[PDB]
């Protein structure tokens, strides 16, 4: 989301920071991981984990 910040004067010298408009689409925040890289790292973790169990 393209966020707009808005300053509100709430007291003498005091500014509250609000969210104003979203500019463009409303979308969800998200994270991406490479699927093959994550699977290979999980295999390495599983192999180091089988030495204890």
């Amino acid at each position: 989301n393209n966020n707009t910040r808005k300053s509100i004067r709430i007291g003498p010298g005091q500014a509250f920071y609000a969210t104003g408009d979203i500019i463009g689409d409303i979308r969800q925040a998200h994270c991406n991981v490479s699927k093959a890289t994550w699977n290979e790292t999980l295999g390495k973790v599983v192999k180091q984990l089988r030495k204890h169990f």
Partner: protein, 133 residues
């Protein structure tokens, strides 16, 4: 190719139903959504509703839900009837077919798209007058 030709009486007394039908020639109901658009004098076009092969009747909320849109592949033709017609409902009635597109702006597994309808093949329209005179 898709041909489509409307049909209707044109002479309807107020406070009853009005039926306009739409016969499609050239092929069957393969690809298409089917929609109805009326145009009254003194104002612009007006989308009134659309259906598809799943028979999901979706109407304009601006037209009171007095409307019934149906179709059949036995006769292979479309049909429209609205209930309790007032004399302000005189208009040219166009039968049209609609393609659905999806506009994708983000992640599709989050549902960040929408569907839109483009009416590509139209018809001439029936000039249906409603009056008791």
């Amino acid at each position: 190719q898709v041909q489509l030709q409307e049909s209707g009486p044109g002479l309807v007394k107020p406070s009853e139903t009005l039926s306009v039908t739409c016969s499609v020639s050239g092929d069957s109901m393969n690809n298409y959504y089917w929609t109805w658009i009326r145009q009254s004098p003194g104002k612009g076009l007006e989308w009134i509703g659309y259906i598809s092969d799943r028979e999901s009747a979706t109407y304009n909320p601006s037209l009171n839900s007095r409307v019934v849109i149906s179709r059949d592949t036995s006769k292979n033709q479309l049909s429209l009837k609205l209930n309790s017609v007032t004399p302000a409902d005189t208009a040219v009635y166009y039968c049209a077919t609609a393609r659905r597109g999806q506009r994708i702006y983000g992640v599709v597994s989050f549902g960040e798209f929408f569907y839109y309808y483009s009416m590509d093949v139209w018809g001439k329209g029936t000039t249906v007058t409603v009056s008791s005179a």
